[PDB]
Amino acid sequence: DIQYKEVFAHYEDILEDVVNKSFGNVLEFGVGTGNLTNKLLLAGRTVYGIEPSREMRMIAKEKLPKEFSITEGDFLSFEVPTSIDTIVSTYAFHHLTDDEKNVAIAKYSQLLNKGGKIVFADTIFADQDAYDKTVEAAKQRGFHQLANDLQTEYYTRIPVMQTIFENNGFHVTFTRLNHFVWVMEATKQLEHH
Residues annotated within a binding site for S-adenosyl-L-methionine:
30, 51, 74
- 3 state SS for the chain: CCCCCCCCCCHHHHHHHHHHCCCCEEEEECCCCCHHHHHHHHCCCEEEEECCCHHHHHHHHHHCCCCCCEECCCCCCCCCCCCCCEEEEECCHHHCCHHHHHHHHHHHHHHCCCCCEEEEEEECECCHHHHHHHHHHHHHCCCHHHHHHHHHCCCCEHHHHHHHHHHCCEEEEEEECCCCEEEEEEEECCCCC
The answer for residues whose C-beta is within 8 angstroms of residue 60's C-beta and 6 or more apart is 31, 32, 33, 34, 37, 49, 51, 68, 70
Q: What resolution in angstrom units was achieved for this structure?
A: 2.8
Query: Per DSSP, what are the bridge partners of residue 71?
Result: 50
Give the count of alpha carbons within 13 A of 78, CB side only: 25
Residues annotated within a binding site:
30, 51, 74
The answer for residues whose C-beta is within 8 angstroms of residue 3's C-beta and 6 or more apart is 138, 142, 143, 145, 146
**Which string of b and e fits 145-171 if b means at least 16 CB within 10 Å?**
ebbebbeeeebbbbeebeebbeebbbe
Domain boundaries, the chain: 1-193
Experimental technique of record: X-ray
**Distance separating alpha carbons of residues 160 and 98, to the nearest angstrom:** 8
**Distance separating alpha carbons of residues 32 and 19, to the nearest angstrom:** 16
The answer for residues whose C-beta is within 8 angstroms of residue 125's C-beta and 6 or more apart is 131, 134, 155, 156, 157, 158
Q: Taking a C-beta distance cutoff of 8 angstroms, is the pair 161, 101 a contact?
A: yes
For residue 168, which of 150, 144, 183, 187 has the smallest C-alpha distance? 187
Q: How many Cβ atoms from other residues are within 10 Å of residue 142's Cβ?
A: 11
Q: Taking a C-beta distance cutoff of 8 angstroms, is the pair 73, 79 a contact?
A: yes
Q: How many Cβ atoms from other residues are within 10 Å of residue 47's Cβ?
A: 23
Q: Between the CA of residue 11 and those of 35, 113, 128, 171, 177, what are the distances in Å?
A: 10, 30, 25, 25, 9
CATH class for the domain made up of 1-193: alpha beta
Positive/negative CA dihedral, 124, 126, 130, 132 = positive
